[PDB]
Amino acid sequence: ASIKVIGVGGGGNNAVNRMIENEVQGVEYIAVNTDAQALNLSKAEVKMQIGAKLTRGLGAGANPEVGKKAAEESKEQIEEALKGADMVFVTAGMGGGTGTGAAPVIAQIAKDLGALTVGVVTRPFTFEGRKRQLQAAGGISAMKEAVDTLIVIPNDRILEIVDKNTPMLEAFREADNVLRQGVQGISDLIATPGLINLDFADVKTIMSNKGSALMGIGIATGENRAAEAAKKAISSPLLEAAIDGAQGVLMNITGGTNLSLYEVQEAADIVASASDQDVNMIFGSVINENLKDEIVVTVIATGF
Amino acid sequence: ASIKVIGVGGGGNNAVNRMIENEVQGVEYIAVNTDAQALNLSKAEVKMQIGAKLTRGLGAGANPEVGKKAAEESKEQIEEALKGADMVFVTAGMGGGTGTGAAPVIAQIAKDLGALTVGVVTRPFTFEGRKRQLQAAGGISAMKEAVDTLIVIPNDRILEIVDKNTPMLEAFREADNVLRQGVQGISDLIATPGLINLDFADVKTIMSNKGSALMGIGIATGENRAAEAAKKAISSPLLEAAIDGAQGVLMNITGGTNLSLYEVQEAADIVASASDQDVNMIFGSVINENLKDEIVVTVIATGF
């Protein structure tokens, strides 16, 4: 499949950088921004400055209507960058001017090109202030109408996972990495050979015109790791609701070379038992040799 | 010498990235910003978020007084990052909130630590608008009082050099690269073995408490290249004034392996003839093997 990951605005650009840094296979990267400096820091080969006439490379401020207009200014160039894609991941931090306003435009473009369009976006941390929070909710509504499936990750839940003395800059970097795992959790199953892959059509049945979706991540080491990562994924603080409310579930279990098929099934089993009995569930597994005795379960719940 | 290059705000962060990309030797990189996304895109090992309480990682807006206050919030951490430096290059695009306001604070910190403090900053392009232009001039005055030498590069002059159809995003990337060449033109002579190096004390005599400075860059290929690069450097559109107004001049001539000592002298000679008869002039040369038949002359004129 031709898969494109388009990172919109600061947060989205960082997610794309995290993916490049982690050598995610089988995807093309596009970095999009109204801020030319941010964009020139991007490791992506395709760097798309949007709303050059409107913003002059200076960014959108915090106004999402400016981000929207900048994307509208650059419709034709966004179209050209996305032509040929079978699947487009639109990734963004919601709350600011560019992500919140430009991401929904770009998602709708991807859709109008016939791509399976998956949004993977964050709600901002509470410490970013109340206006960012409200703007984000508006962007999330707008995104919902423009994508096939929209994964929303609340950044405040990251803080319930990480060390309480995690500095602000590292908290932001953790959110980039969650966005990365939301994209890569799906993509790797279609596009990276591992232990169990999925056909694009399986993923599509789960994501196509489904609306709201959630993500849980579970990490565990050593004995009982498969059961524990699974139980941790399905109870992840990242989950805004329980996965039994979902029409579809996708599970990715990623491990090192000691990951076994019976471990994958036992994770799958736990996830299936947690899901609706009439869920459509699919799952796969890939190997990352940097992992030793710890595995990672990522669960995407679609169609709430 | 312990040399630190501290890039402040978007433009400054990009300059530091350009240096890292070009494997500049013998310097430590610090990336500084109020915008946590930009900063997390930086390739520098030391990433310093300033004004975390004041700005929440959201940036300074376009208000330089916010950049100033953010730096003031983080004085202690800026001090800790700069301790031990013999020379500090503070690099920034002037015009916006963070560079314009934070850079002068950081320069004065470097000075109060005993560093030879060289500012290398740009005036913004006219297309960035009139307010950015005015703010920039204010920042440049503020910087002048805080550094030993302040190199100012007008971005609009880049446009007189590059192709008229150069896209906006690439114009910005060209300004980053000019800032890079202003830093690296000095640093390489002290810190990278080549054909003729300078002692730190020579450079210091030229830069210390000198105030305003200018830069010219000349590039030429093949026959007569040394004479031509030199004549092009001394007549560079980047120069806001003629170099004969300077108390000091530094020349760096960089070439591939066919660069000769007699070529270096003949460049030096041209630059000396263009300078005041009572200039203090110093010069050096280094080799970059990616250069074939083209050489690069960079001239820094100090003490106007």
Numbering used by the authors:
A (entry chain A), B (entry chain A): 12 to 315
Question: What did the publication describing this PDB structure actually write?
Answer:
We examined three globular proteins from three phylogenetically disparate sources including: FtsZ, the cell division protein from B. subtilis; NS5B, the RNA-dependent RNA polymerase from Hepatitis C Virus; and P38α, a human protein kinase. Based on this analysis we defined a truncated form of B. subtilis FtsZ spanning residues Ala12-Ile316 (termed "FtsZ truncated"). Specifically, we used Gene Composer to define structure-guided protein constructs for crystallization studies and showed that we were unable to obtain protein crystals of full length FtsZ, but did obtain multiple crystal hits from the truncated, engineered FtsZ construct.
Two additional crystal forms were obtained in the presence of lithium sulfate. Not surprisingly, the sulfate ion forms non-bonded contacts with residues in the T1 and T4 loops. The sulfate ion is positioned in a nearly identical manner as that observed in a recently published full length Bacillus FtsZ structure.
